């Protein structure tokens, strides 16, 4: 017989449970609905469903009406709407986490073993006719052909919203502290056991590497001096595992928390910036605490860099990414009234969703020079040659690519987009419409409703055969964008819940930690509350370059 859970009968976060040989039951508990399919709405849910404006309309209100938002930002309505964004979006992510690659049900092993990634929806069952359930073809399109035909950049499409490569390397640096997929254990497994903003891309994902990176004097990290400037130390001075070209000159390798940050100059740029910030904070703490040993000067400075990381990513990173006239705010006290679990567990869908390789340009313009991928990838001297001031200045002027819309990935890194499609089939992710229904959206009825477009949609209808068989990552990238925006509807309504739940589920946002004694007094606590990326760069440099998440006018 056919597995009935292949039909995805349970609506609105209902739980399909097989009974007997061939039957099933949906668990409608606290879904807001009742009935066999969990489709009979309750009274409050019906009222809030008919009074619910569409996400595109909300994007219209938040991106227009500048006279209104100048009033909203100057009053308490800013705090009210910020609390609304946080609670409504993070309510949509399960905490405690539910499933993983091993278990399509709730288990103690899925809870306690943090080596897994979690997942929002279950896998497609093994006994389904179609690889995506019941609708579609008996085999799926070629990932190389989908990437070549629909995701490959032909002409560079710049982000209309003004996004930097300073933004894009910040997004690669920031997201690789909780995206470390284990090559040994396989897909669905992670080495980043913090599952969030722990800065394990700076201090290491385990304790032994952390002690290999620490100076053990004044709480500082180890470092080396080149041309009078502070850089991460050599692997000869900090002997820990760093991926590099086989046959480099170590004594020119640099040791940082993330094993792969040597492979790109912008990633080692940010690692240099944060290391300089760590030791500056250590100087500020030691001035105020002469009695502290090495551990307390270290751990409190780590908490300061964690806090100012979340400050910068909410009020500048997500601010630039949203385009909102509403000025976003990082205040953990906004959640002190609600029931909010201060935990995070990285989802595999959220790993699929941060493949923002369209941000990468055709070439890397640094002043008068223009470097190709072969000149930029794996390059080891460009950081020390130009300096952090000059690479921040050059990356904050070059435009980044638009994420959504399709057909904007360079061919040098298009292979990544290929593997993430193939990995999406290994992990048995559900169809794109099922993730739209899970994150509060209506499924698409046709491919041309997806793309807003005639050619690609019809060729996709030849490849997939049904809209209900479209895969997750191609659906996120081939979706139509909101007008003059970085990406489209599904990247909004799926990416924001994971990202904000990951930012305020950090325990430093809890009532138990969010106080001045945690950060060594009012000095470090105002370092968290006052952090910009301009202060992250220009306080750790000799000159202050142009530093921003957007291009200049």
Ligand X SMILES: COc1ccc(-c2noc(CC(=O)O)c2-c2ccc(OC)cc2)cc1
Ligand Y SMILES: CCCCCCCCO[C@@H]1O[C@H](CO)[C@@H](O)[C@H](O)[C@H]1O
Ligand Z SMILES: *[C@@H]1O[C@H](CO)[C@@H](O[C@@H]2O[C@H](CO)[C@@H](O)[C@H](O)[C@H]2NC(C)=O)[C@H](O)[C@H]1NC(C)=O
Ligand U SMILES: *[C@@H]1O[C@H](CO)[C@@H](O[C@@H]2O[C@H](CO)[C@@H](O[C@H]3O[C@H](CO[C@H]4O[C@H](CO[C@H]5O[C@H](CO)[C@@H](O)[C@H](O)[C@@H]5O)[C@@H](O)[C@H](O)[C@@H]4O)[C@@H](O)[C@H](O)[C@@H]3O)[C@H](O)[C@H]2NC(C)=O)[C@H](O)[C@H]1NC(C)=O
Residue 534: both structure tokens together: 């301009």
Residue 67: both structure tokens together: 């006279």
Least distance in Å: CB of 472 to ligand HEM? 14
Residue where the block lists tokens 């609905």: 33
354 is catalytic: yes
**Which of 103, 173, 176, 482 is an active site residue?**
176
Does 496 interact with ligand X (rule: CB under 6 A)? yes
State the Cα–Cα distance between residues 41 and 179, nearest whole angstrom: 38
550 is in an annotated binding site: no
Containing 31, the helix (H) or strand (E) segment is none
Least distance in Å: CB of 206 to ligand U? 6
CB-nearer residue toward ligand Z: 218 or 385: 385
- For Cα atoms 84, 434, 483, give the angle at the middle one, nearest 5 degrees: 60
Q: Which of 302, 235, 261 is nearest to 177 (CA)?
A: 261
Least distance in Å: CB of 514 to ligand Z? 25
**How many C-alpha atoms does 490 have within 13 Å on its Cβ side?**
31
CB-nearer residue toward ligand Z: 62 or 226: 226
Of residues 10, 334, 366, 491, which one binds ligand X by CB under 6 A? 491
Three-state secondary-structure class, residue 460? helix
Contact map string, positions 85 to 124, toward ligand Y, x by CB under 6 A: x--xx--x--------------------------------
State the Cα–Cα distance between residues 225 and 156, nearest whole angstrom: 39
> Total residues at the site for ligand Y (CB under 6 A)?
20
Of residues 218, 331, 385, 449, which one binds ligand Z by CB under 6 A? 385
**Which of 223, 354, 435, 473 is an active site residue?**
354
Does 89 interact with ligand X (rule: CB under 6 A)? yes
Residue where the block lists tokens 């692997």: 235
117 is catalytic: no
Q: Which does 115 bind (CB under 5 to 8 A by kind): ligand X, ligand HEM, ligand Y, none?
A: none
Q: Which of 221, 218, 184, 183 is nearest to 199 (CA)?
A: 221
State the Cα–Cα distance between residues 174 and 21, nearest whole angstrom: 47
Q: Which of 208, 202, 314 is nearest to 259 (CA)?
A: 202
Total residue length of the chain:
553
> Total residues at the site for ligand Z (CB under 6 A)?
11
Burial class (CB in 10 A: 0-12, 13-18, 19+), 280: middle
State the Cα–Cα distance between residues 351 and 200, nearest whole angstrom: 17
Contact map string, positions 111 to 130, toward its own copies, x by CB under 8 A: xxx-----------------
For the chain, report the end-to-end CA distance as a whole number of angstroms.
62
Q: Which of 223, 240, 204 is nearest to 279 (CA)?
A: 223
Least distance in Å: CB of 281 to its own copies? 14
For binding to ligand Y (CB under 6 A), which residues are involved? 12-13, 54-58, 60-62, 81, 84-85, 88-89, 92, 440, 483, 493, 497
**Which parts are annotated binding residues?**
357
Catalog residues that contact ligand HEM under the rule CB under 6 A: 168, 171-172, 175, 179-181, 264, 351, 354-357, 359-360, 377, 413, 416, 419
Interacting residue ranges for its own copies, rule: CB under 8 A: 15, 17-21, 25, 27, 29-30, 94-96, 98, 102-103, 105-113, 193-194, 198, 207, 288-292, 295-296, 299-300, 302-303, 306, 336-343, 507, 510-513, 515-518, 520-521
Question: Which residues are at the interface with ligand X (CB under 6 A)?
Answer: 85, 89, 318, 321-323, 353, 485-487, 491-492, 495-496, 499-500
């Amino acid at each position: 017989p056919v597995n009935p859970c292949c039909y995805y009968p349970c609506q609105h976060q209902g739980i399909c449970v097989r009974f007997g040989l061939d039957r099933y039951q949906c668990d409608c508990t606290r879904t807001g609905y009742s009935g066999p399919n969990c489709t009979i709405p309750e009274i409050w849910t019906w009222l809030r469903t008919t009074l619910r404006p569409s996400p595109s309309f909300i994007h219209f209100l938040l991106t227009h009406g500048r006279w209104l938002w100048d009033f909203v930002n100057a009053t308490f309505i800013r705090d009210t709407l910020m609390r609304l964004v946080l609670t409504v979006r993070s309510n949509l992510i399960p905490s405690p986490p539910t499933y993983n690659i091993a278990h399509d049900y709730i288990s103690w092993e899925s809870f306690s073993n943090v080596s897994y990634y979690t997942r929002i929806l279950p896998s497609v069952p093994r006994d389904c006719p179609t690889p995506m359930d019941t609708k579609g073809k008996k085999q799926l399109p070629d990932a190389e052909f989908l990437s070549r035909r629909f995701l490959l950049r032909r002409k560079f499409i710049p982000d209309p919203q003004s996004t930097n490569l300073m933004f894009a390397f910040f997004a690669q640096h920031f997201t690789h502290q909780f995206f470390k997929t284990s090559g040994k254990m396989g897909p669905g497994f992670t080495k980043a056991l913090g599952h969030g903003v722990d800065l394990g891309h700076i201090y290491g994902d385990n304790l032994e590497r952390q002690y290999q990176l620490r100076l053990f004097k004044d709480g500082k990290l180890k470092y080396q001096m080149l041309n009078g400037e502070v850089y991460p130390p050599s692997v000869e001075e900090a002997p820990v595992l760093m991926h590099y070209p086989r046959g480099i000159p170590p004594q020119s390798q640099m040791a940082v928390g993330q094993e792969v940050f040597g492979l790109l100059p912008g990633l080692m740029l940010y690692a240099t910036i944060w290391l300089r910030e760590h030791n500056r904070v250590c100087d500020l703490l030691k001035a105020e605490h002469p009695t502290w040993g090495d551990e307390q000067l270290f751990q409190t400075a780590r908490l300061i860099l964690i806090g100012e990381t979340i400050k910068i990513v909410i009020e500048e990173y997500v601010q630039q990414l949203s385009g909102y006239f509403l000025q976003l705010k990082f205040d953990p006290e906004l959640l002190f009234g609600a029931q909010f679990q201060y935990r995070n567990r990285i989802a595999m869908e959220f790993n699929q969703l941060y493949h923002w390789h369209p941000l990468m340009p055709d070439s890397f313009r640094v002043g008068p020079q223009d470097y190709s991928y072969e000149q930029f990838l794996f390059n080891t001297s460009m950081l020390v040659d130009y300096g952090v001031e000059a690479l921040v200045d050059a990356f904050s002027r070059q435009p980044a690519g638009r994420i959504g819309g399709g057909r904007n990935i360079d061919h040098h890194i298009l292979h990544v987009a290929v593997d993430v499609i193939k990995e999406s089939r290994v992990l048995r992710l559900q169809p794109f419409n099922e993730y739209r229904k899970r994150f509060g959206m209506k499924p698409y009825t046709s491919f041309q409703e997806l793309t807003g477009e005639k050619e690609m949609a019809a060729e996709l209808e030849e490849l997939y055969g049904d809209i209900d068989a479209l895969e997750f990552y191609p659906g996120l990238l081939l979706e139509k964008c909101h007008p003059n925006s970085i990406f489209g509807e599904s990247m909004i309504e799926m990416g924001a819940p994971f990202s904000l739940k990951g930012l305020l589920g950090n325990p430093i946002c809890s009532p138990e930690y969010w106080k001045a004694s945690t950060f060594g007094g009012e000095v470090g606590f105002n370092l968290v509350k006052t952090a910009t990326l301009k202060k992250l760069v220009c306080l750790n440099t000799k000159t202050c370059p142009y530093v921003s998440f957007h291009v200049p006018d």
